Amino acid sequence: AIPQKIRIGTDPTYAPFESKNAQGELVGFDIDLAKELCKRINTQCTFVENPLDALIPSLKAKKIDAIMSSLSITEKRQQEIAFTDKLYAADSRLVVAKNSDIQPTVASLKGKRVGVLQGTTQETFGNEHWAPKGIEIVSYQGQDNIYSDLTAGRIDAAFQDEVAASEGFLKQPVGKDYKFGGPAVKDEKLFGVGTGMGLRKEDNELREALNKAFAEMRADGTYEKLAKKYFDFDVYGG
């Protein structure tokens, strides 16, 4: 029905969306979004932190009740779980050293190591369009160990969403020497064009009330205020 305590699973390795801080506290625009969605439907929310590859199964095991983890909405994920309406747009791009040639293409990526987070939409674009053409796909848990292997030379490109790379790495002094290398690779039916909150297919009423609550947060100006402490561009798109 509408559960009185909902357990939201998150992977806390993805700034600015969800990440831990000095005071250990969970922090980020997806965290802020869910806190506000929860008050608004008026129920107690607790966050469970797990790796992103474990969330979509924990949900089907009722170990958690929602997923908020910048989880992009895609045709394939949707033939297993349900999602709210679009919370904001996502785009994928590879990050490269400023001194590395590396392309969105089997050409200059041939025989290079691209790192992807396990469970993600770009781990699966990397296996279907890119490993057969000879570029090696290295999967990780913890988005922060991918950026850390990139700056150490261990991998040659880091593959993930644009705004997290941008805000969480390239605008930080550790990504000063790095850059996006190439466009966003285009695959609308694999990547999806936005993220949402993941929910079981059978919970139609907790899904309907989250959609209403979010709708309202976009119309009274609460979304624009929550977005503005992280972004100076329009995160939502349209």
Chain residues binding its own copies by CB under 8 A are 21-25, 32, 35-36, 38-40, 42-44, 220-222, 224-225, 228
Four-point Cα dihedral 94, 87, 41, 53, nearest 10: -30
To the question of whether residue 77 is assigned a binding role by annotation, the answer is yes
**Binding flags for ligand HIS, 110-129, as an x/- string (CB under 6 A):** -------x--xx--------
How near is the Cβ of 1 to ligand HIS at its closest, in Å?
28
**Binding flags for ligand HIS, 72-111, as an x/- string (CB under 6 A):** x-----------------x---------------------
- Token pair 């600015």 in the structure block, residue: 16
To the question of whether residue 69 is assigned a binding role by annotation, the answer is yes
Interacting residues with ligand HIS between 148 and 177 (CB under 6 A): 160-161
- Token pair 């969330």 in the structure block, residue: 55
Q: Which is nearer to its own copies, 24 or 173 (CB)?
A: 24
139 to 113, 119, 136: CA distances (angstroms): 10, 9, 10
How near is the Cβ of 33 to its own copies at its closest, in Å?
11
Binding partner of residue 19 among its own copies, ligand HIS, none, CB cut-off 5 to 8 Å per kind: none
- 41 burial (CB, 10 Å; 0-12 / 13-18 / 19+) is middle
- Crossing angle of helices 204-219 and 29-41, rounded to 10°: 110
How near is the Cβ of 111 to ligand HIS at its closest, in Å?
25
Q: Are 100 and 181 in contact (CB under 8 A)?
A: yes
CA distance 21 to 222: 24
CA distance 138 to 34: 31
Structure tokens at 15: 């700034």
Structure tokens at 82: 């349900």
Interacting residues with ligand HIS between 198 and 237 (CB under 6 A): none
To the question of whether residue 161 is assigned a binding role by annotation, the answer is yes
Structure tokens at 232: 């100076």
How near is the Cβ of 185 to ligand HIS at its closest, in Å?
13
Which of 89, 81, 30 lies closest to 57, judged by CA? Answer: 81
Binding partner of residue 208 among ligand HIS, its own copies, none, CB cut-off 5 to 8 Å per kind: none
Q: Which residues are annotated as a binding site for L-histidine?
A: 69-70, 72, 77, 121, 161
- Chain positions contacting ligand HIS, by CB under 6 A: 11, 14, 52, 69-72, 90, 117, 120-121, 160-161, 195
